[PDB]
Each structure stands twice: as C-alpha cells, then as structure tokens.
C-alpha cells in the first residue's frame, strides 16, 4: 500500500502513487518534498509534520494546520490534495503527511523582474482575493511576504500558508491589529515590484521602524498616544521626519500609460499608511480602479470555508480522509 524513501535524515513513508520525491523545504513546520502524483498525474507537495505531538505546543499547530487546510478553499490559496498516515492504528499513530498543490516559484524573484501593469495589478488582484478569503474565514495572516506568495508560469497566484521587513507597524510594535494589517504587506510587496528592492530595509525592528517613519513621515500625535510609553519616548526623541510624496518615493522613472502609473501610486499611497486606522481595507483595495479591472464576484467574494488527547483529535482529523 505504502513504501519508504529515504530523504536526508528522515524517512518518508508515503502512498505509492507519489514518486520522484525531492526535498524542497525544511523548517519548523516540517519537511516538504516535491513529488509526482501518478494518479492526478501532476506535481504535488508532500509535507511530513515534524514531531506532530512531542509537546502540547506542536500538536496544536498540527491540529491547527489540518483543520484549516480542510475547510479553507479558494483558487488563490494553496489547495490541499490529501492527508494520510502510514500507521495502521491510533496506538501506533506517529506521522502526519499533507499533500498539497505544487507551484513553480514564490514572488522573491518575479518581483525583481519586469511586470507590466497587467501582470502587476493582476498578481496583486489575486493576492487581495486570497487574503480576503483568508480574512472572511477569521484568519489574519500577518506574515505575508515574497517567499510567502507562490505563483505559476500561467500567471496565477496563491497564498502558501495561513501564517500565524514586510511586517506592519502594529506588528513590529507590541500593538493590536485588525484585518488591514495584511494590506501593509501588500503595500510593501507591491512597492518592491516597482522599486526593485525591499522598500523598508531594517537591520533590526528598531532600524526598520526608523526607515519607515523617515520615509513616510512621522504619524500624527493621536497615534503616538496609542503607543507604548517606552517606544513613544523613543520616537519623540528624533528629528522631525516629514516623509516624501509618493511621486518622489515612486517616480515615473519606474512606470511604463499615464493613467495606470498614477493609479498604482495612488493605491500605494493608501496601503502604506503607518496609522492602521487611515489605511485602506481589502474591499476598498479590490474596488480601487487599478485592481478593479479583473474584479469578479465569484473570486473576490466566494462564500467562507466554515494532552495525549491531541493525538486522537489529529488522528480523527486525518482519518476523515
């Protein structure tokens, strides 16, 4: 029924339908292999959870990923294709394998490429749709970035994971956030495509913070009040940072067509707002005239998704196929 392949120092015991495994990842989550699906006849991604339950900490994350991956369903989000265990019983239950869609690359390089407004605004359109579905499911990523967004040669895009320089101020700082926390990231990723390099490069969360302020300008006093005592002192001790105009930050020397270059800037001007309360929302971003051209209600507004005890919960989740 199953078979075993040795990849690195771990043993991948998976369904015989999957072959040509090759490790393409290895983080906290676990090990990810690229593999050929002989039944669907397509390339998939097999993820073997690392220590599913070797501590109440891991189990909840494992239970977290499984449940979400199940209900969550959109084209602009990594699609689940299978979840299986090589173990015959709950007693022996030890490994969790999640098969998902396999994409061609993330936006780490395509961002430093040359995209026309079509490809530019389209990829972004698709980000907004996936992020919105995530949101309409109570999931607020908070950690979107180039290596987080995956794409295909046919110009389609998807969000890789449900998350938790591209972080929003609310996040860099110990502040509370809302759903538009992810618009900042979109604002960052969009801007980096036009620039060609990371918008706000910070050697550390403090420097990072300085780059942004110096660039966009210091926020209004109403925001400063909403700041922790210690950090508020820090900002009030620096020179007056007025930021620059988006025409200076984003000069026409980067855009190809008079209307579209201005629109992309106007949009950037509403996503890169320090004060989260004056920052554009996804719905508004999807309606913006630079993004709205690809708008489709079926995409942009698709209906929402939905101890030793953790071993059973997970197992039960996995056994529901």
């Amino acid at each position: 029924n199953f078979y075993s392949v040795e990849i690195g120092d771990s043993t991948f015991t998976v369904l015989k339908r999957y072959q040509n495994l090759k490790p393409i990842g290895s983080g906290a989550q676990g090990i990810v292999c690229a593999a050929y699906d002989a039944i669907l006849e397509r390339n998939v991604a097999i993820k073997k959870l690392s220590r599913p339950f070797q501590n109440q900490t891991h189990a909840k994350r494992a239970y977290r990923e499984l449940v979400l991956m199940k209900c969550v369903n959109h084209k602009n989000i990594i699609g689940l294709l299978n979840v299986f265990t090589p173990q015959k019983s709950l007693e022996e239950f030890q490994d969790v394998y999640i098969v998902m869609e396999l994409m061609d690359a993330n936006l780490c390089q395509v961002i430093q490429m040359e995209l026309d407004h079509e490809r530019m605004s389209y990829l972004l359109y698709q980000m907004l749709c996936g992020i919105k579905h995530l949101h309409s499911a109570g999931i607020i990523h908070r950690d979107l970035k180039p290596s987080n967004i995956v794409v295909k040669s046919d110009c389609t895009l998807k969000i890789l994971d449900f998350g938790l320089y591209y972080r929003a101020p609310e996040v860099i700082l110990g502040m509370g956030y809302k759903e538009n926390v992810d618009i900042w990231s979109v604002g960052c990723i969009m801007g980096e495509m036009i620039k060609g390099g990371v918008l706000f490069p910070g050697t550390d969360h403090i420097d990072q913070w300085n780059k942004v302020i110096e660039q966009l300008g210091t926020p209004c006093p109403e925001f400063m009040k909403k700041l922790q005592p210690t950090v508020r002192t820090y900002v009030e001790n620096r020179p007056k940072y007025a930021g620059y105009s988006f025409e200076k930050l984003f000069p026409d020397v980067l855009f190809p067509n008079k209307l579209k270059a201005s629109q992309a800037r106007d949009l950037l001007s509403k996503m890169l707002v320090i004060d989260a309360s004056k920052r554009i929302s996804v719905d508004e971003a999807l309606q913006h005239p630079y993004i709205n051209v690809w708008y489709d209600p079926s995409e942009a507004e698709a209906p929402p998704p939905k101890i030793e005890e953790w071993k059973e919960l997970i197992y039960k989740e996995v056994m529901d196929l």
Partner: peptide, 10 residues
C-alpha cells in the same frame, strides 16, 4: 481586458 496567460519566472 484579457487576463495574463503567462508570467516569465526564469
């Protein structure tokens, strides 16, 4: 407006 059918990853 037709949607891009390709993106050059290379």
């Amino acid at each position: 407006p037709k949607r891009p059918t390709t993106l050059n990853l290379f």
